Design a protein around this ligand. Structure first.
Ligand SMILES: [Ca+2]
Ligand SMILES: [Ca+2]
Length: 684
């Protein structure tokens, strides 16, 4: 199938995702609505259920609202059964309308629909070329008070109807009983409760197994992608192990939410995107876009600086999901914000790198500050706004022009209020010019681009005052960019040599199938390379001009560049593919008596690529934790490691450049065939 097909669950680079709160979009079936105090027919009390459901989403796919808007994927609320109880938080009744307070991850939420309704959502969507992404929240169940079992449902978890356990009298240790996080460190936010939400203990092997089994059920139902909630609040090691079981079973595009409040690099956030096996919501792109277009606190140089720095930090910047707002911040539209600034921020997100997501109602200019006002009922299904028109003209370009979906980004002209940038992939080129100044036009002279000689019409057809241009071997004739204008000019052609645009997933064990997307691979099965290893023949499960599916070779675990050769021409290399040693389990490593100096941290390495193959650098594990589950001078860390394998390891202390290793012989441990384990040793 081509890269562009609805069938491509491994890459959303050619898609535009529409993020919807299922409850707030359309009540397509009033008979499944909640009753009593939990429901509000008028939807003016935004903490209660308004009644929106999966039949409502089926209706709008069927009357072409989404196809006309041009979105090609729906990201919906968590589909699983949530608590039924209502919770009174200081006088105001709160419900689980948002989907985040799960109680059974193997059943549907009956207010959104039955399993049959879910299956009908998947079929209807796929028949229209729309992918389905679901929220999944493995960090917690629901609000719970250990001392008061009458509060809410005491965070009880059910396994398809059978009780597994609640937060009070949790003798099995399914949940953490460490109090609530104060968010003072990474560690503190992982092993304590987020507010009053009962925190899962994923080191408990029943819970590990439960979540591997629960996600398999939803993948077997045809979901195309997963948005993981609260990835900052769960151990990276457990999440990498859970990600490797998804990719070994039915690989789908997965991204997480790790909140950031500015456009600055955050080392922990960069590491998570690079090492976990999943990508992230791009809050750094989002802060720069709001600062420049919404709040006027930065100018166009902050936009370009964020483009360069994120392309540098993230190994696969094209896997990061971009947006101008969402469920965690004020709606982009405010009375102080003009419509053209929102339309411009949409035009910029849709033509920039990453996977763009639009929060439902953006095309209707929905307002709302804070939670829950930013989650208002979908106000109209009008197809007439300029915002609607901008998304329907630009979203198709991610499918028809590979420079938008996969290209690099280069600055071509910039000053405080004007930004002109270019996307390029092979011979395809897209150039976007934006003038955010609402009252004065800009005379543009000396612009050079990669557009071939020719004249170019604005893809937006002048709806944002864009103009047409003329290229003479890339030099653009002088023109005036109007007040508030944005114009998009493009050139696509067929690629003749192989060039790789995306590989998904970028982590797996031998035997897993990965998807290579791009252009110019031809119809004749060639060879794929993982480093030096050539993979040919039957190992390549399908080969066409824009997409290859290939089995990962049995080669040593490590970091590899993937390259394709078609008719003796070698492509560009796609870097940083992780091959794992095999199936993964999560092991908690605990080391006693490791005293340290001020500013000295503890790290772990060992003899498999998952522990860094004896390196003391960025592939080593750590720094280890020492506050919540075990306390200094005991340190601990949860690590994804190959299953059923005898491992050798040592801890080491590192303060700057100087490394001090444990003495003696290596510690050894044989990992379990599945699940989790804990190994405790003493510092030598
Ligand atoms: Ca309903
Ligand atoms: Ca947690």
């Amino acid at each position: 199938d081509p890269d562009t097909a609805v069938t491509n669950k491994q890459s959303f680079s050619t898609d535009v995702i529409y993020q919807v709160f299922t409850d707030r979009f359309l009540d397509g079936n009033p008979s499944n609505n909640p009753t009593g105090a939990a429901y509000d027919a008028t939807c003016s009390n935004l903490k209660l259920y308004c009644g929106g459901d999966w039949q409502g989403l089926i209706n709008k796919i069927n009357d072409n609202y989404f196809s006309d808007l041009g979105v090609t994927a729906l990201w919906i609320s968590q589909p699983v059964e949530n608590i039924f109880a209502t919770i009174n938080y200081s006088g105001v009744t709160n419900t689980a309308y948002h989907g985040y307070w799960a109680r059974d991850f193997k059943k549907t939420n009956p207010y959104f629909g039955t399993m049959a309704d879910f299956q009908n959502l998947i079929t209807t969507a796929h028949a229209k070329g729309i992918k389905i992404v679901i929220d999944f929240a493995p960090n917690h169940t629901s609000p719970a008070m250990e001392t008061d079992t009458s509060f809410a449902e005491n965070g009880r978890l059910y396994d398809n109807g059978t009780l597994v356990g609640g937060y009070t009298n949790d003798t099995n240790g399914y949940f953490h009983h460490n109090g609530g996080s104060d968010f003072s460190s990474l560690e503190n936010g992982i092993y304590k409760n987020l507010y009053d939400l009962a925190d899962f203990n994923h080191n408990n092997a029943t819970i590990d197994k439960y979540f591997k089994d629960a996600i398999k059920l939803w993948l077997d139902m045809g979901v195309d992608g997963i948005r993981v909630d609260a990835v900052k609040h769960m151990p990276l090691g457990w999440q990498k192990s859970w990600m490797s079981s998804i990719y070994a079973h039915k690989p789908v595009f997965t991204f997480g939410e790790w909140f950031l409040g500015s456009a600055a690099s955050d080392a922990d956030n960069t590491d998570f995107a690079n090492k976990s096996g999943m990508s992230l919501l791009d809050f750094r792109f989002n802060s720069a876009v709001r600062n420049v277009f919404r709040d006027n606190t930065s100018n166009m140089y902050a936009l370009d600086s964020m483009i360069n720095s994120t392309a540098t930090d993230y190994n696969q910047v094209n896997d990061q999901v971009t947006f101008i707002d969402n469920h965690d911040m004020d709606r982009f539209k405010t009375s102080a914000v003009n419509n053209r600034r929102l339309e411009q921020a949409l035009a910029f997100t849709l033509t920039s790198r990453g996977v763009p997501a639009i929060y439902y109602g953006t095309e209707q200019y929905l307002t709302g500050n804070g939670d829950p006002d930013n989650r208002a009922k979908m106000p109209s299904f009008s197809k007439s706004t300029t915002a609607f028109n901008v998304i329907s003209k630009l979203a198709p370009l991610r499918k028809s022009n590979p420079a938008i979906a996969y290209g690099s980004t280069q600055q071509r002209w910039i000053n405080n209020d004007v930004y002109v940038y270019e996307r390029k992939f092979g011979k395809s080129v897209a150039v976007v010019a934006v003038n955010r100044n609402l009252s004065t036009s800009a005379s543009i002279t000396g612009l050079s681009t990669s557009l071939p000689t020719g004249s170019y019409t604005d893809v937006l057809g002048g709806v944002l005052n864009g103009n047409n241009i003329t290229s003479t071997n890339g030099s653009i004739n002088n023109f005036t960019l109007a007040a508030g204008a944005t114009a998009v000019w493009q050139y696509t052609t067929a690629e003749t040599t192989p060039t790789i645009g995306h590989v998904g997933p970028v982590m797996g064990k031998p035997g897993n199938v990965v998807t290579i997307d791009g252009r110019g691979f031809g119809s004749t099965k060639g060879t794929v390379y993982f480093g030096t290893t050539a993979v040919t023949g039957a190992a390549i499960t399908s080969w066409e001009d824009t997409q290859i599916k290939v089995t990962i070779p049995s080669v040593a675990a490590g970091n590899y560049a993937v390259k394709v050769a078609a008719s003796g021409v070698n492509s560009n290399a796609y870097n940083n593919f992780t091959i794992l040693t095999g199936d993964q389990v999560t092991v908690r490593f605990v080391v006693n008596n490791a005293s340290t100096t001020l500013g000295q941290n503890l790290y772990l390495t060992g003899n498999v690529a998952e522990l860094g193959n004896w390196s003391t650098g960025s592939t080593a594990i750590g720094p280890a934790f020492n506050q919540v589950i075990h306390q200094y001078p005991t340190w601990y860390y949860d690590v994804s490691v190959p299953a059923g394998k005898q491992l050798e390891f040592k801890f080491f202390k590192k303060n700057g450049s100087t490394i001090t290793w444990e003495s003696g012989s290596n510690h050894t441990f044989t990992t379990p065939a599945s699940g989790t384990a804990t190994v405790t040793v003493n510092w030598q």
